[PDB]
C-alpha cells in the first residue's frame, strides 16, 4: 500500500528494548550524515567565493595541491564502488519481499550522492587555496565513521561473520571512512591552518608561473590525469585556428632535455667511476638507463598487471550471465533470508554492472600504462640526443679516427638508432607482462573446457613464430625494394 521506510510490518518500528537494537534505526542514523553533508555543502558551492579581493587575472592561471591528493582520490573512488555494491545488494534483496524496504538501499543511494559531492567539494576547495573550509569535510567523515561502526558491532553481536555479505561491505566501508579521516587529519597537520599559530608558506609550482607551459599533465588532479580531460580545449581549438608551434607552448622543467641529460650523465659517471677501479670491466649503457629511468617502468608494469587482471572479467561475467539465464526462476522456492555472499555473484543483473565497471577500469589502467612508458621513452630519447651531441663536439679530425664514412654513421646513429631504442623502451613492459596474461588465459581455458583447451592453445600459440618468420622475410624484401 503506502510507501514506508522500515517496511510494512508494525513490529519493525518497536523501540522497546533499545533504539540501537532496532536495525532500521541504525539505518536511519546512517542515512543522517549524508544529508547533513549535502545541506552544508550545496549552498557553499552554489554561492561561490568569487569576491575579487586580489588580482586574480594571473591567480586563476595557477593552483595547488594539498598533502594527501592521490590517496584521497583513490579512496573516494573505492568508496563509490562499495556503495554501488551496497545499492545493488539492497535492491536485489528488496525484490525478494512483499513490501518495499527502503532501509536496505536508500541509505546507500544517499551515501553515493554524498560521496560524489564530497569529492566535488574537495576539488573546488583545493583549486582556490582555502584549507579552513575543509574542516567541514572533517566533521562529515568522523560522523560517518561512528555511525557505520555502530552498525558493525550490532551485526557482530549476532555473530554474522564474514560469510554474510552485508557484514563484509560494512567493514570495508568502516575502514575506508577511517582512512579518509586520517587523510584529513594529516592535511591539518601539514598545513597548520586551524589550531596552529603560524600557517605554512606554500606557492604553486614554478612552471605554472610561466605563461608558455601548455602541457598540463603533471599539474592536474588524478581524475583529469587519468582521462586526459585537460586536453579538450587544445583539441577543440583545432577548428577556430589550426595548431601552430605556439599552441604547444613549452616543456615543464621536469621534462626538458637538459635535466634528463644531467640525470643520465650523472648515472653514467657513477657507472664509469665504479668500473674504472674494476680491472677489466667494460662500460654499460643499460645500467645507466636503469637507476635513472627505472621507477616509471615499474609503475607502468604495475598498471599493466592491473589491467591484465581486470581484462578477464569479460569471459567470467559472460559465463555467469549465460549459465544464469538458462533456467527459468519459476521453479525455485521462496527464500526470505538475505542473499548469500556467493548468491550475490550468481545474479544476472549484478554481473552486468560488474562487467561494466571492470571494462571502464581496465581501459583506464591500460592507457595510464601506455602514457607513462611513452613519456619515459621520450625523455630518454631527449637525454640520448643531448649526450650524443656533447660527444660529437669533442671529436678528433684525424684520419685515423675519422673515416671516409663517418658522417654517415653519425647520421644513422641520430636518425635510426635513437628511434629504434626509443620504440623498444615503449614496448619494454610487454616483455614480462605478456607471458602472465597468456598463461592465465590458458589456465582459464583449461578450467573451462577440460583438456581440449590444451589443444586449442597449442594451435593458437604458433601464431607468434609464424609471424616472426614472415616479418623477417618481409624486412629483407623491403630492404631490396629500398635499394
Amino acid at each position: 500500500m503506502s510507501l514506508s521506510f522500515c517496511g510494512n510490518n508494525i513490529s519493525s518500528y518497536n523501540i522497546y528494548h533499545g533504539v540501537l537494537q532496532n536495525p532500521c534505526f541504525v539505518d536511519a542514523l546512517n542515512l543522517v550524515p549524508h544529508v547533513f553533508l549535502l545541506f552544508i555543502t550545496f549552498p557553499i558551492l552554489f554561492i561561490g567565493w568569487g569576491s575579487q579581493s586580489s588580482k586574480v587575472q594571473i591567480h586563476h592561471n595557477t593552483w595547488l595541491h594539498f598533502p594527501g591528493h592521490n590517496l584521497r582520490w583513490i579512496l573516494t573512488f573505492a568508496l563509490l564502488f562499495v556503495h554501488v555494491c551496497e545499492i545493488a545488494e539492497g535492491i536485489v534483496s528488496d525484490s525478494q519481499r512483499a513490501s518495499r524496504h527502503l532501509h536496505l538501499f536508500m541509505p546507500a543511494v544517499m551515501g553515493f550522492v554524498a560521496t560524489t559531492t564530497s569529492i566535488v567539494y574537495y576539488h573546488n576547495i583545493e583549486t582556490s587555496n582555502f584549507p579552513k573550509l575543509l574542516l567541514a569535510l572533517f566533521l562529515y567523515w568522523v560522523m560517518a565513521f561512528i555511525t557505520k561502526t555502530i552498525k558493525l558491532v550490532k551485526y557482530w553481536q549476532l555473530g554474522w561473520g564474514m560469510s554474510d555479505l552485508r557484514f563484509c561491505i560494512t567493514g570495508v566501508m568502516v575502514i575506508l571512512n577511517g582512512l579518509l579521516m586520517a587523510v584529513e587529519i594529516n592535511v591539518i597537520r601539514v598545513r597548520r591552518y586551524v589550531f596552529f599559530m603560524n600557517p605554512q608558506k606554500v606557492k604553486p609550482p614554478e612552471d605554472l608561473q610561466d605563461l608558455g607551459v601548455r602541457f598540463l599533465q603533471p599539474f592536474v588532479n588524478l581524475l583529469s590525469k587519468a582521462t586526459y580531460w585537460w586536453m579538450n580545449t587544445l583539441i577543440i581549438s583545432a577548428h577556430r585556428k589550426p595548431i601552430d608551434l605556439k599552441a604547444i607552448g613549452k616543456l615543464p622543467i621536469a621534462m626538458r632535455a637538459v635535466t634528463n641529460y644531467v640525470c643520465l650523465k650523472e648515472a653514467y659517471e657513477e657507472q664509469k667511476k665504479k668500473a674504472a677501479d674494476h680491472p677489466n670491466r667494460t662500460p654499460s649503457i643499460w645500467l645507466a638507463m636503469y637507476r635513472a629511468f627505472g621507477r616509471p617502468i615499474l609503475l607502468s608494469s604495475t598498471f599493466r598487471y592491473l589491467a591484465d587482471l581486470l581484462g578477464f572479467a569479460g569471459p567470467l561475467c559472460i559465463s555467469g550471465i549465460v549459465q544464469r539465464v538458462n533456467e527459468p526462476k519459476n521453479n525455485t522456492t521462496r527464500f526470505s533470508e538475505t542473499l548469500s555472499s556467493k548468491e550475490f555473484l550468481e545474479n544476472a543483473h549484478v554481473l552486468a554492472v560488474l562487467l561494466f565497471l571492470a571494462l571502464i577500469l581496465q581501459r583506464t589502467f591500460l592507457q595510464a600504462s601506455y602514457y607513462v612508458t611513452i613519456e619515459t621513452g621520450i625523455n630518454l630519447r631527449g637525454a640520448l640526443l643531448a649526450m650524443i651531441y656533447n660527444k660529437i663536439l669533442r671529436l678528433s679530425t684525424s684520419n685515423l679516427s675519422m673515416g671516409e664514412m663517418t658522417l654517415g654513421q653519425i647520421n644513422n646513429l641520430v636518425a635510426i638508432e635513437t628511434n629504434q631504442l626509443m620504440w623498444f623502451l615503449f614496448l619494454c613492459p610487454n616483455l614480462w607482462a605478456m607471458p602472465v596474461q597468456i598463461i592465465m588465459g590458458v589456465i582459464l581455458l583449461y578450467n573451462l573446457l577440460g583438456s581440449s583447451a590444451l589443444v586449442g592453445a597449442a594451435v593458437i600459440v604458433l601464431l607468434a613464430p609464424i609471424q616472426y618468420f614472415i616479418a623477417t622475410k618481409l624486412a629483407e624484401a623491403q630492404k631490396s625494394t629500398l635499394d
Partner: protein
Amino acid sequence: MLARKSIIPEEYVLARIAAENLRKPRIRDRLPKARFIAKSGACNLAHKNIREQGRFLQDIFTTLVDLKWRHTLVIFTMSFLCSWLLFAIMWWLVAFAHGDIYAYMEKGITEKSGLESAVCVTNVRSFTSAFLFSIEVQVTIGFGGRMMTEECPLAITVLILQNIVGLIINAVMLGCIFMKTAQAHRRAETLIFSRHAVIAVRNGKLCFMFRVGDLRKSMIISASVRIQVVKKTTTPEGEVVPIHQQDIPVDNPIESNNIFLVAPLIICHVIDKRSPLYDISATDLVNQDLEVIVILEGVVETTGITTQARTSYIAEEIQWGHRFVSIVTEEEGVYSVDYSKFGNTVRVAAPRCSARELDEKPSI
C-alpha cells in the same frame, strides 16, 4: 596500432620549394604590441608571485550579498527548502526513537483506541507529517493539528534550535533582498569615447583632440579629466623604467580639469615644448612606442557613486591631420545632437612635420 614503428626512410627527404627557395622564412607573423590599458577601458596586465593571503569565510558572505537576481532567488529558495528538510528529518527521528510511530500505528490499526497521552509531538506518524510540522514551525504557520507537548525535552531542544535557525535565515535573506533593493540605480557606465583621436591645428598650434560624451540622463557632478602618456624612458644616468606614465596638461582657459558634460565635448591638449608628443611627425606615427590614456571621473547625481571611465589610444588609432565634424546643429527651435556623427572624422590640410620642427621655421 603501431603506425610507423619501422623508421628507416628519412634523412633524405629533399627540401621543399619554400625551404630551398626561402619563401617560408618570410614569416611576417609578429605578435601585436602589448597594450597597457585596453580599448574597452580595462587594464590588462599579469601580476605574478603575489603572496597569497589565503581566503576568509567573510568572502562567501561578501559574494552572497552581491549576486544576480537570477541567483538570489535560487539561493533564497534552496536555503528555505533545505532548512525545512533538515528539521523534518530531525522530527521524524525524534518520533521514531520515542516510540510514537509505533504507538500511532498500533492505535490506528484499532483506531477506536484513540490514545495520544504520551507522545513527543502529537499526530506525527510518518515522514510526511514530520515534513509538514517542520514547515509549520519554520514558517510559523502553526495550524495546530500537530502540537508540541510537554512530554519529552529533546523535542523542546529541537524546537528551540529550529526557531533560532529560522530567525537567522529569515534575517539574512531579508538583509540580502534589502541591499539589492537599495542598489537599484547602480547598473552600469554610459560614457562614450571617440574611436580615433585626430591631431589638428588650432590657432596656429597643433593639438591632440578626442571626443567624449554621455548616454545616461543623470548628470555627472564635478567631472575631471586626466590624460597620460605611457612609454619607456631613460634618465641621463641610465635607469630604464619599462612603463613610465607621464601626465600631460589639458587645454582650459583657467587651467583646470573640470569639464561640464551635457552635450558632447572635444578634449584637446596642445603640443608645447614640454609635451611628450613635441617631437613626433606624421611619418613617425606609423610605428612608434606610444599609448595615450584618458581617465574621466565624477559622481552620478542619482546614486552618488563615484565613476571612473578609462580608455587608451595607440599609434594606429591616431588620425594625424583630421578633425571632428560638428555633431551639434540647431533644430527648428531647439539645439540638437546627431549622435550618429559622433566618431565621424573629416579630413583637412595640416603640416606634415613635427611641432618640434614646426616652430623652428614658423613662417610655413
